[PDB]
C-alpha cells in the first residue's frame, strides 16, 4: 500500500495550491480552487501571481509567513479574497522543492499556535490535577475531556499491543449507541504504512466518506512529484472508505499518542472519534486536540515509572523477608512461624516434604496426591532441582485432571535428593471478546486485496485452563531460599516449561537475591563478610576479619572503605549503638567509598544477633541498594506521614477545649433551672436547651460525604422553628433585616416526628449568606404549611413545605453552581450549603431556590415523619 | 605562654603514670604514687622495669596486644588487675614522639570506645528529637542533658564571640545558687594557649584544686624531653587554681565544642561544669560526654544553615513587592496601595517628600522635623544620594535632641533634586553585664599577673543613642527602588555612618537587587529583555526582540536558548496561557542552556498584564535564581502544601459550623438577661457568660506549643474564682463528692490586673483529674493566696498562689514525667497539663504537686499585676 505517496485526490472542502521555492508562482491547483477562492477576473492557471487573489494586507501577511523559518508556528493564517473579501484559513507547509497551502472557508478565535493552544486550557488543568498512580482513570479523564471539547458522537482510546494488534481501553458515547469497550481487533486492520505515517502526521480528519472528491490538475512541465502525505486535505483509501462505511460512521477525527520510551518513539495508541453524520471542525480545535494529546503522552510516561518503582519495592520486600528467614532455625522454622513461605512468592498454596512428613498451607491437593507427583518429578527430571509450570497438564503429569481444578500452577524445588518444597497457584479464568490478532503471524501487506472483512460480532476465544506465569524474580527468590536451606541443613538447572514453548533450558539463574550482609560481635570486631558484600566493596573477607568495624574497616582515614566525613562516622556509631535496644530494621542512609573510587549509596538495616540464651551477641546488618528515585519517594512519604500525624494533637486539643466550656454551660443552665419563671421563660429555656444540644451534637461527630445514619428521636416543630430564627437573626440585625411573622398557626397544631438537631441542621444555614448581598433595611419572608399524607403502615408523612425569602443581590451564578457540586474549589463558607443539601436528599427531599423577578424564594420540602 | 605547659613535671594525685620506650617496652618514667599504688603490700620500680612484672598474665597479654596496634584510641579504657592483690585499674594509653605513655586510674566497686559511647544514648536521642529552627532551645536542652548526665553543682554553655571574649548563654544550677546567666567576660580570661590546646584534648577534668600535686621521675640520660600535654593527669597552671578558688568551685569538668565551619574548624565555645565539693568522674563518662559534644556540634552547625536560608528567602521577597503598581499613579502608588514602602525594609515609619507634601505612615516625627532634615541634607550633604544613620545624634544635625527617644535611626534616599524618601527606626533598649570585653589588647597577661582580679558580683554598662544597624541588602533594595522611580519619572555613593564615625562612602551599593525579566505581547512576540536577563543568558537584546518566545527563543532545537527536552517545551507553553487566563502569578521550575552551554536552573514567576481599561495586553515574567538547597526545600514543601491546606480548610469549616449555634446561644442568653432577675440569677448568668467567652477566645485561631501570649485587663478575682470552681463540682455526678467553701476571704475581696478568659483555662482544667481517680466520698480543698507586694516600679505585684489537695490514687510516675516535657507518649490530659504549664511559665509561674502522707498537695504560683 505504497501509492499513498502518489495519489492525486483531495477532499472537496478546501482548496490546495502549490508554489515553487523562489518565484512564489502557482504550479499546481485543484478543480474547486477557481469556484471557491475567486467566485462566490483572470482564470487561475499555472504561474498566476498570488497577489491577484488576496488583498494587500492578506498578501503581505502570507508573504511574511512564506519567508519565515519555522512555518509550523504561524498557521492558521486568516486571509481574504479580492472582491467579496471571503475569509479563509491558509495553512502553509513546505516539502522538498515546493510550498503547499490549504484553504478552508471560515465560519462554517485563534491566529497562531499559542492562541490555538489556549482552547484546551481547561482540559489540561483537569488532566494535571489527577491523583497519580492509575492509568485507567487517566485514560477515562482524557477521553471525557476530548468528548466534551470536540462534540463528536463517540470517542475512544485504542491501545496497541506487542503483537501489533490493538484493544480499546476507554469509551464515552451518547445514549443509544452500542458499547465498543473491551473489544480486540486484528493487527491487519491498521497496516504498518499507516502507523508509520502517523509518527509525523499526528492528527487526521475525514469530513465525509461518501463525498465526491476533486483531482489535482498538476502541471505537466514540472519535474517534481508532488506527494500529498503532509497535507491536511488527502483523500483516504477506497479500502478504508469501505471500512468506514461498513461501521456506519461517516466522519472521523483521530490523534496519535507517541510516547518516548527509552529516545525511542513508540506509538502507544490512538484517540479516535466517530460521528454518524458529516462533521467539520475548525483548525484551531484540531491543534488544541494535538497539544492535549502531547500532555496525555507525557503523563502515560510517568505511569510506567510508577509501575517500575512498585516492582522494585516488591523485590526489596522479598530481600528483607529472605534476610529474616536466614536467622531462624531450619527447616521447620520456615513454615511454623510468620511470615512463612507463602509470603515469599505470590501463590495460593504451599507444601513441604521433609523426612516423609508433609506440611501443607493454603489450598493444596490432598496429601495422597503429593508423593506421586514428587516421584514423577524425581524420575523424569533428574538433571534439575527446580521446575516451574503454569499448567500441570502441559508438563506431562498423567493425573493432572484427577486432582481437580483448584490448583494448576506449580513451582517446585529440591533442597535435598529426597525432600522437596513447592508452591501452588490456582488456575485463573477470563476470556477476551473478539480474537486478539485472529492468530495470523507474519505480515500481509500485499495491496492486492479489496476488503477481506465485513460486519462484527462477539467472537469469544476460549482458554486452556491456565494460571498466571512465574516471573524472573519469583524464581530468583526460590533459588535463594533453596541455597539458604541447603547450606543450613548441612551444576544444576531450572526448567521453565511455559505454554506455547513447551520447554526451556534456563540455567539456575545464578543471580540470587541475597543482599550484602555483615555483622560484628559485642566488642566491635568484624565477624561476618558476605560474598555479595565482597563483590560490592572489592574487599576480600580475609582482609576484614577480626578488625574493628568502626575506625578500621569503616572510617574517614587509613580505613579500608573510607567514609565521606566525620558526620557519617558519628551517625554510624549512633546507629550501631541504637540497634542494641531495638529490633525494628531502622533503614538509615549509608554512603561510602569502595576500594577504588565509587560513591556507593544504600539503605542500612541493623538488628541484634540474639542467641538461644537470650543475651545479645552482636549486631547483624544488611545493606539494600535502591535507586535515587525510590529513596526520594520514601523520604517524601515519610515527611508527608509525619505532617499528617502532627495535626491530630491540634484537633484533639481543639475538641477538648470546646467540650469543657460547653459542659460548664449545661452545668450553669441546669443549676439555674431551679429559679423557675413564667411560661415564656420556660420556652426560652427550651430554645436554649436544643441550641446547646445542637452545639454538642456538632461536637459529637462518612457524614462529610453526605452519608447519614439517620438518628431518630421524638420532637415537635415549635422549638426547632424558634431556634432556626434565633440562631440567624443576630447576623441580620446588623444588616437591618426585619422579621415578618408570616408563618401560619396551623403548622404547629399537628404533632410532628423527627429529631431536633437533625431537623435544625439543614434549615438555618440557608439564609446566612443572605445578609452578604442584602442592602440595609431588608425584609424577611418565611411561610410554612405542613402536609399530612397518610402513606405507610406505622409512619405517616409530614411533608414539609417552607418558602424562605431571598433579598438583595443574592447568590450569583458562580456561587449557585457550587451548591450542585459542579465545582472543585468550593469556598469554605459554602460547604454547609451542599452538606445540608446532601443531608436533605439522603431522605429523598429537596432544598432549592430558583431565580425570580425582584426577589427569589427558597423552597424546602422534606418527607419528615409524622408522630400521629 | 604555651612553653610552660609543655615541660610540666607534675600530675594530679588521683592516678599513677608510666612512660615506656617504643621498642624494648621498659619503664623509662614513673610517678611517686605509682610505687605505693600499683604494688601495695617490693622490687625496684625504677627505670628499665618490664611492664609484665606487675600485672597478672591475662592483663599482661591484653596490654601487650594493645601496645602493638596502629590506632589505639579505639581500645582504651583497658581493664587491668595486679598480681599482688587483684586491684582493679583502668589503663589509658597514648603515644608521643619516642614514648608510649600509660596512666592508671582506680576503679570504684560499682571496655572500649563503643561501649563507652553507650552511656549517652538517651541524651543523643533527646537532642535528635527536637524540631529545628531555633538555637536557644537547643542550647538549653544540651545544658540540661549534661547536668543530668554528669551530676554536678552547675553547668553552663559559654559561647565565644568574634572578639574572642565570651558570654554565658544558658545555665542550670541546683537550688540555692546565684545564677550567672547572660553575663560577659573578657577575652583574657582564657589564654590562647589553652584555646589552641583544646582542639586536641576535648575533655579536661580537675578533681581538687587544693590537693598536693605529685611529681614524676624521668632518667636524665635521654636525648629528648617528655611531653605531658596529652595526658589526662596534667596539673593546671597555678593562676588558674587561684582563679577557681575565687568562685569557690573546687572541682571542674570542661568539654570543648569544635564546629567544622565550611575543612576549617572553629571553637564555638565550652560547656563548663562547676562543683563546690571535690568530685571524680570515671573515664567512660568522659568519653560519653565527648561523643555528646560531637553530636551537639553537628546540630549547632546544622542550625546556622537555616539562618542563611532565611536570609535568602528574605532577599527573594524585596524583588516581588511593587513590580507593576509603579507604572500607575507614580510615585503616589507606593504609599496609597498596600503593600507600601513600609514593607520594603524592616522600619518603624516612613515618609515621602514629593511636591511639597508629606505622606507619612506609622510612627514619624512632625512635618517641621522632616523639613528640617531635608534642608540639612540639602545643605551639608550636597554631593550625597542616600545615607543610613544608626543614630541621628552621631551625625549631629542641629535639632537632634528635640525628638529624642521617638526616632533615632534614619535611612534617606534621594529621588531627585527636591523629592526624597525617609525610613525611620525607633530607639532600641539594650544593656550588657560585667562589661562587654574589658578591653586590654596585645596580651597584657604574659609571664606575669599572678592574680590581679578578685570576686566581683556584677558590672553594669549602659550604651546610649543607638538603634538597630542597617544591613547591606536593606540598602541595596532602597537603591533599586530609587532606580525604578528615577526610570519611571522620565554611580553616586552612599554614606554608612553606623558605629562611631569616619563615614564610609560605599560605592553606590554594588548590588542592585532587580531580577531578570522578559515579556511578550498578545500574539507571542517578545517585547522586553532587560540587561539582567541578557547578562544571565549571554544574549543581546536585539537578537531576541521581534522573535517568538516559544520555538524561536526557548525551543528544543535551532533556538537561541535551547531547552532540556520536549517535556520542558509543553510545560512552558502551559504556564504562558494559565498566566493570562487566571491573572494571578504562578511559580514553576525552569531550566535551560545558555548560548555558552551552561545548565541553568531557576524559578519562573509569571503574571498577566492589563491596561487602564482592564484589557489584557500580554504577559510579563521574571526569574528568581533560588539556591540549590532552597530549591529542593521549596520543592518538597510544595509537594505536601496541597494536602496541608486541604486538611486546614476542612478543620476551619467546623469553626463556622460551631460559631453559628454559638451565636444562637449568645442571642438567647442576651435576651434572657433582659428580664427581671434576682441577685442569684444575675450571678449565675455572669458566671455562664464568663465560662462561655472562653470558647470564642480559644477559637480565635502555635495553638499547641509556642507563640502563646496571655491577654491582660483589670478584673476582680471573685468572678473567675466562682465560675471556675462551680463548673466542675457536678462533673463527677456518679460519685457524689463533697465540696465546701475553703478559700481565703482576703483573696476574693480585692481586684487586680489580669484576664479572666485564660484564668479559667488555667485553674479550672487542673481539677478535672481530682475527680477521675478519687472514689466516692472524696473531699476537695482549695486554698487561695494573693500576695500584694510592691516588687517593682510601675506594676504592683498581686502574686496568685493556688493550693489543691490530691486525694485518690494520684498521678503515677510516667504520667508525672509528661508534665515536665520529657516523654514522647503524652496523654491528652497530660498534653493539656503540659500546655497549661507552658502557658503559665512565661511570666514566672510554677505549677507542680508533691506527694505527702495520705494526700498530695499542689502548688501553683503566678506573678500577677495589681491595678490599684
Ligand atoms: C475501532 C477501531 C478502528 C480501527 C481498527 C480502524 C482502522 C483504521 N483504518 C486505518 C487505516 C487503514 N486501513 C486500511 C485498510 C484495511 N483495513 C481493513 O479493515 C483491512 C484489513 C484493510 C483492507 C485491505 C488502509 C489502507 C489504511 C490506511 C489509511 C488511508 O490511507 O486512508 C486507520 C488509520 C486512521 C485514518 O487514516 O483514518 C484506522 C483508525 N478504525 C476504527 O475505528
Ligand atoms: C564562667 C566562665 C569561666 C571562665 C571565663 C573561666 C576560665 C577558664 N580558665 C581556663 C583556663 C586557663 N586560664 C588561664 C589563665 C588566666 N586566667 C586569668 O584569670 C588570667 C588572665 C590568667 C592568669 C592570671 C590558665 C593558666 C588556664 C589553665 C591552663 C592550664 O591549666 O594549663 C579554663 C579552661 C579549663 C581548664 O583548662 O581546666 C576556663 C574555663 N572559668 C569559668 O568558669
UniProtKB/Swiss-Prot annotation, chain A:
Changing residue 239 to A: Unable to bind the chromophore and cannot be converted to Pfr, fails to accumulate in the nucleus and to interact with FHY1. Residues 653-866 form the Histidine kinase domain. SUPFAM superfamilies: ATPase domain of HSP90 chaperone/DNA topoisomerase II/histidine kinase, GAF domain-like, PYP-like sensor domain (PAS domain). Phosphorylated. Contains one covalently linked phytochromobilin chromophore. It is found in: Cytoplasm; Nucleus, Nucleoplasm; Nucleus speckle. It comes from the Eukaryota. Keywords: Chromophore, Cytoplasm, Kinase, Nucleus, Phosphoprotein, Photoreceptor protein, Receptor, Repeat, Sensory transduction, Transcription, Transcription regulation, Transferase. GO terms for molecular function: far-red light photoreceptor activity; identical protein binding; mRNA binding; phosphorelay sensor kinase activity; protein homodimerization activity; protein kinase activity; red or far-red light photoreceptor activity. Phytochromobilin binds at residue 239. InterPro entries: GAF, GAF-like_dom_sf, HATPase_C_sf, His_kinase_dom, HisK_dim/P_dom, PAS, PAS-like_dom_sf, PAS_2. GO terms for cellular component: cytoplasm; nuclear body; nuclear speck; nucleus. Induction: Induced by cold. Residues 134-304 form the GAF domain. The keyword DNA-binding does not apply. Disruption phenotype: Blind to far-red (FR). Impaired inhibition of hypocotyl elongation and cotyledons expansion under continuous FR light conditions. One of its GO terms (biological process) is response to very low fluence red light stimulus. Residues 499-573 form the PAS domain. It holds the Pfam family PAS_2. Changing residue 158 to H: Constitutively active in the Pfr form, leading to a constitutively photomorphogenic (cop) phenotype and reduced accumulation in the nucleus. Expressed in fruits, flowers, leaves, stems, seedlings and roots. PHYA association with FHY1 and FHY3 protect underphosphorylated PHYA from being recognized by the COP1/SPA complex. Regulatory photoreceptor which exists in two forms that are reversibly interconvertible by light: the Pr form that absorbs maximally in the red region of the spectrum and the Pfr form that absorbs maximally in the far-red region. Photoconversion of Pr to Pfr induces an array of morphogenetic responses, whereas reconversion of Pfr to Pr cancels the induction of those responses. Pfr controls the expression of a number of nuclear genes including those encoding the small subunit of ribulose-bisphosphate carboxylase, chlorophyll A/B binding protein, protochlorophyllide reductase, rRNA, etc. Belongs to the phytochrome family. Homodimer. Interacts with NDPK2 and PKS4. Stabilized by interactions with PAPP5 and FYPP3 which are enhanced in the phosphorylated Pfr form. Interacts with COP1/SPA1 complex. Binds, via its photosensory domain, to PTAC12/HMR when photoactivated; this interaction stimulates its localization to photobodies. Interacts with FHY1, FHL and FHY3, especially upon far-red (FR) light illumination; when underphosphorylated. Forms PHYA/FHY1/HFR1 complex. Binds to PIF3/PAP3. NCBIfam families: sensory_box. This is Phytochrome A. The lineage of its organism: Eukaryota, Viridiplantae, Streptophyta, Embryophyta, Tracheophyta. The gene is PHYA.
Amino acid at each position: 500500500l505504497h501509492h499513498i505517496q502518489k495519489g492525486k485526490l483531495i477532499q472537496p472542502f478546501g482548496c490546495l495550491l502549490a508554489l515553487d521555492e523562489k518565484t512564489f508562482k502557482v504550479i499546481a491547483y485543484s478543480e474547486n480552487a477557481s469556484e471557491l477562492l475567486t467566485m462566490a477576473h483572470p482564470v487561475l492557471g499555472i504561474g498566476t501571481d498570488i497577489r491577484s487573489l488576496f488583498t494587500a494586507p492578506s498578501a503581505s501577511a502570507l508573504q511574511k509567513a512564506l519567508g519565515f523559518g519555522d512555518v509550523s508556528l504561524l498557521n492558521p493564517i486568516l486571509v481574504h479574497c479580492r472582491t467579496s473579501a471571503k475569509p479563509f484559513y491558509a495553512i502553509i507547509h513546505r516539502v522538498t522543492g515546493s510550498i503547499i497551502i490549504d484553504f478552508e472557508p471560515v465560519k462554517p478565535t485563534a491566529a497562531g499556535a499559542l492562541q490555538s493552544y489556549k482552547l484546551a486550557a481547561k482540559a489540561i488543568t483537569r488532566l494535571q490535577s489527577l491523583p497519580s498512580g492509575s492509568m485507567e482513570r487517566l485514560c477515562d479523564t482524557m477521553v471525557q475531556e476530548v468528548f466534551e471539547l470536540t462534540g463528536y458522537d463517540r470517542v475512544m482510546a485504542y491501545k496497541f499491543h506487542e503483537d501489533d494488534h490493538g484493544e480499546v481501553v476507554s469509551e464515552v458515547t451518547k445514549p443509544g449507541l452500542e458499547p465498543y469497550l473491551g473489544l480486540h481487533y486484528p493487527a491487519t486492520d491498521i497496516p504498518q504504512a499507516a502507523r508509520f505515517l502517523f509518527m509525523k502526521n499526528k492528527v487526521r480528519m475525514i469530513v465525509d466518506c461518501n463525498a465526491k472528491h476533486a483531482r489535482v490538475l498538476q502541471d505537466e512541465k514540472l519535474s517534481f512529484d508532488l506527494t500529498l502525505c503532509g497535507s491536511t486535505l488527502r483523500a483516504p483509501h477506497s479500502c478504508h472508505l469501505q471500512y468506514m462505511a461498513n461501521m456506519d460512521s461517516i466522519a472521523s477525527l483521530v490523534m496519535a499518542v507517541v510516547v518516548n520510551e527509552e529516545k525511542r518513539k513508540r506509538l502507544w495508541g490512538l484517540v479516535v472519534c466517530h460521528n454518524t453524520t458529516p462533521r467539520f471542525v475548525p483548525f484551531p480545535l484540531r491543534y488544541a486536540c494535538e497539544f492535549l494529546a502531547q500532555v496525555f503522552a507525557i503523563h502515560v510516561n510517568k505511569e510506567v515509572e510508577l509501575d517500575n518503582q512498585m516492582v522494585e519495592k516488591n523485590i526489596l520486600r522479598t530481600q528483607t523477608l529472605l534476610c529474616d528467614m536466614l536467622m531462624r532455625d531450619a527447616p521447620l522454622g520456615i513454615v511454623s512461624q510468620s511470615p512463612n513461605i507463602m509470603d515469599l512468592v505470590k501463590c495460593d498454596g504451599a507444601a513441604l516434604l521433609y523426612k516423609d512428613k508433609i506440611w501443607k498451607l493454603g489450598t493444596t491437593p490432598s496429601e495422597f496426591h503429593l508423593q506421586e507427583i514428587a516421584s514423577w518429578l524425581c524420575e523424569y527430571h533428574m538433571d534439575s532441582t527446580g521446575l516451574s509450570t503454569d499448567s500441570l497438564h502441559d508438563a506431562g503429569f498423567p493425573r493432572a485432571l484427577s486432582l481437580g481444578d483448584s490448583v494448576c500452577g506449580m513451582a517446585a524445588v529440591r533442597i535435598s535428593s529426597k525432600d522437596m518444597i513447592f508452591w501452588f497457584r490456582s488456575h485463573t479464568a477470563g476470556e477476551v471478546r473478539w480474537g486478539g490478532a485472529k492468530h495470523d503471524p507474519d505480515d500481509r501487506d500485499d495491496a492486492r486485496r479489496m476488503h477481506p472483512r465485513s460486519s462484527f460480532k462477539a467472537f469469544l476465544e476460549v482458554v486452556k485452563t491456565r494460571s498466571l506465569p512465574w516471573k524472573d524474580y519469583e524464581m530468583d527468590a526460590i533459588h535463594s531460599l533453596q541455597l539458604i536451606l541447603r547450606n543450613a541443613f548441612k551444576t544444576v538447572m531450572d526448567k521453565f516449561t511455559r505454554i506455547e514453548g513447551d520447554y526451556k533450558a534456563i540455567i539456575q539463574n545464578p543471580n540470587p537475591l541475597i543482599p550484602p550482609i555483615f555483622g560484628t560481635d559485642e566488642f566491635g570486631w568484624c565477624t561476618e563478610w558476605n560474598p555479595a558484600m565482597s563483590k560490592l566493596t572489592g574487599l576480600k573477607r580475609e582482609e576484614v576479619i577480626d578488625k574493628m568495624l568502626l575506625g578500621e574497616v569503616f572510617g574517614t582515614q587509613k580505613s579500608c572503605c573510607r567514609l565521606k566525613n566525620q558526620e557519617a562516622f558519628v551517625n554510624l556509631g549512633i546507629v550501631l549503638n541504637n540497634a542494641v535496644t531495638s529490633q525494628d530494621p531502622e533503614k538509615v542512609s549509608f554512603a561510602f567509598f569502595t576500594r577504588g573510587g565509587k560513591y556507593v549509596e544504600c539503605l542500612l538495616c541493623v538488628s541484634k544477633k540474639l542467641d538461644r540464651e537470650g543475651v545479645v551477641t552482636g549486631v547483624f546488618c544488611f545493606l539494600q541498594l535502591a535507586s535515587h528515585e525510590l529513596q526520594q519517594a520514601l523520604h517524601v512519604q515519610r515527611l508527608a506521614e509525619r505532617t499528617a500525624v502532627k495535626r491530630l494533637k491540634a484537633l484533639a486539643y481543639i475538641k477538648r477545649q470546646i467540650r469543657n466550656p460547653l459542659s460548664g454551660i449545661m452545668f450553669t443552665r441546669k443549676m439555674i433551672e431551679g429559679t423557675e419563671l413564667g411560661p415564656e421563660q420556660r420556652r426560652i429555656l427550651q430554645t436554649s436547651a436544643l441550641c446547646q444540644k445542637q452545639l454538642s451534637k456538632i461536637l459529637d461527630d462518612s457524614i462529610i460525604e453526605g452519608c447519614l445514619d439517620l438518628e431518630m428521636k421524638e420532637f415537635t416543630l415549635n422549638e426547632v422553628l424558634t431556634a432556626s430564627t434565633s440562631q440567624v437573626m443576630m447576623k441580620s440585625n446588623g444588616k437591618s433585616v426585619r422579621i415578618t411573622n408570616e408563618t401560619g398557626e396551623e403548622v404547629m397544631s399537628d404533632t410532628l416526628y423527627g429529631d431536633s438537631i437533625r431537623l435544625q441542621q439543614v434549615l438555618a444555614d440557608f439564609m446566612l449568606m443572605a445578609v452578604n448581598f442584602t442592602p440595609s433595611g431588608g425584609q424577611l419572608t418565611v411561610s410554612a404549611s405542613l402536609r399530612k399524607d397518610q402513606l405507610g403502615r406505622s409512619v405517616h408523612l409530614a411533608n414539609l413545605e417552607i418558602r424562605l425569602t431571598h433579598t438583595g443581590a443574592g447568590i450569583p451564578e458562580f456561587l449557585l453552581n457550587q451548591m450542585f457540586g459542579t465545582e472543585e474549589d468550593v469556598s469554605e463558607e459554602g460547604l454547609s450549603l451542599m452538606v445540608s443539601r446532601k443531608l436533605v436528599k439522603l431522605m429523598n427531599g429537596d432544598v432549592q431556590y430558583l431565580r425570580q423577578a425582584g426577589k427569589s424564594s427558597f423552597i424546602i420540602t422534606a418527607e419528615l415523619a409524622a408522630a400521629n
